Amino acid sequence: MENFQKVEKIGEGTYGVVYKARNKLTGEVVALKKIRTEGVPSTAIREISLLKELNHPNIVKLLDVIHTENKLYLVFEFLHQDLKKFMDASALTGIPLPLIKSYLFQLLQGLAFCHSHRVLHRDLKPQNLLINTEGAIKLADFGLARAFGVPVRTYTHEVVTLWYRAPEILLGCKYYSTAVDIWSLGCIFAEMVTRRALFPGDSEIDQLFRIFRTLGTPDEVVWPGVTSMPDYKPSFPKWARQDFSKVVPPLDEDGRSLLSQMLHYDPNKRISAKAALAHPFFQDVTKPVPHLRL
Ligand SMILES: NC(=O)c1cc([N+](=O)[O-])c(Cl)cc1NCc1ccc(Cl)nc1
């Protein structure tokens, strides 16, 4: 290439291929994401460029945005593993509660920062949470979804994961709020605890109905305005709500309480990242060292 020497292909994200690369000059190791298609919005590059200013210990640093050859390259600080792989690796024994709590606490700090700066993630999922050997966890891809509006798919035949999508997005809301990220994080929290995806839908309607089957079909009482949402249908089946005690066993009441607040149907009732940080669940939070095999 130029100043980068490709080390390996880390995968193919929701936008393009990703390579672990080394700056032939500085020797720094980074993750290089090649963005897919022939023009590239000048509006996007401006907004993206703004994200370079988004510095927080729990947010993967966006080192550079390179628009050349009329194609886009994003250079990110590199982390060795993502939470999806770590969760799979910890499946037999489960991630210890102190580490689950540490990660959740750090992720909420990251979200509180992004949200206070009017930046939404919009597509939080285990694969987008990166971890290192020091016990840190960081949010990857903040603000990229907005600088591109609607996601749809990756770029070339790849099944988009809907498991962490907030119900307002599924019901067609056109304006996302910071609440969508809290919902996704609540789903991730539940998954670390039970070692199974909370709402593993395989279609937009299956996703919505899995949510309804567990939290109850929403109505005007718990979610004012829900029946007027774009894709709401009076024909939706009416399921009764289940008990959290059965949803995320054996999580304690502090944890169930916080999760319930992160999973409220009304985006406006859903707890903020800042408020969640003050929840009693974090009274004894610590920063454990994970057993990471690289
Ligand atoms: N910032 C990053 O470091 C990073 C970025 C992206 N991405 O989307 O631009 C992706 Cl996919 C993975 C990453 N690393 C985690 C990782 C995963 C697997 C291996 Cl072998 N090595 C590292």
Ligand 1 atom with the smallest distance to the CA of 12 is: 11
128 has binding-site annotation: yes
Task: For 33-98, give the DSSP string.
Answer: EEE---S--HHHHHHHHHHTT---TTB--EEEEEEETTEEEEEEE--SEEHHHHHHHTTTT---HH
141 has binding-site annotation: yes
Ligand 1 atom with the smallest distance to the CA of 33 is: 9
Active-site annotation holds for 123: yes
Q: Which residue has the tokens 């005690």?
A: 245
15 has binding-site annotation: yes
Backbone angles phi, psi at 130, to 5 degrees: -105, 145
Taking a C-beta distance cutoff of 8 angstroms, is the pair 215, 242 a contact?
A: yes
Kindly give the distance from the C-alpha atom of residue 263 to the centroid of ligand 1, in angstroms, as a whole number.
Answer: 28
How many CB atoms neighbour CB 33 within 10 A? 24
Question: Tokens in use for 197?
Answer: 């995806």
Q: Whose CA is nearest to atom 22 of ligand 1?
A: 80
Method of determination is X-ray
How many CB atoms neighbour CB 213 within 10 A? 15
**Cis status of the peptide bond prior to 267, with omega within 30 of 0:** no
Sheet with 129-131, side-by-side order of all strands: 81-82, 129-131, 137-139
Kindly give the distance from the C-alpha atom of residue 294 to the centroid of ligand 1, in angstroms, as a whole number.
Answer: 13
CATH of 1-80, one of 3.40.50.450, 3.90.1150.10, 3.40.50.720, 3.30.200.20: 3.30.200.20
Ligand 1 atom with the smallest distance to the CA of 14 is: 8
* Domain residue limits, the chain: 1-80, 81-291
CATH of 81-291, one of 3.40.50.1220, 1.10.510.10, 3.20.20.120, 1.10.3720.10: 1.10.510.10
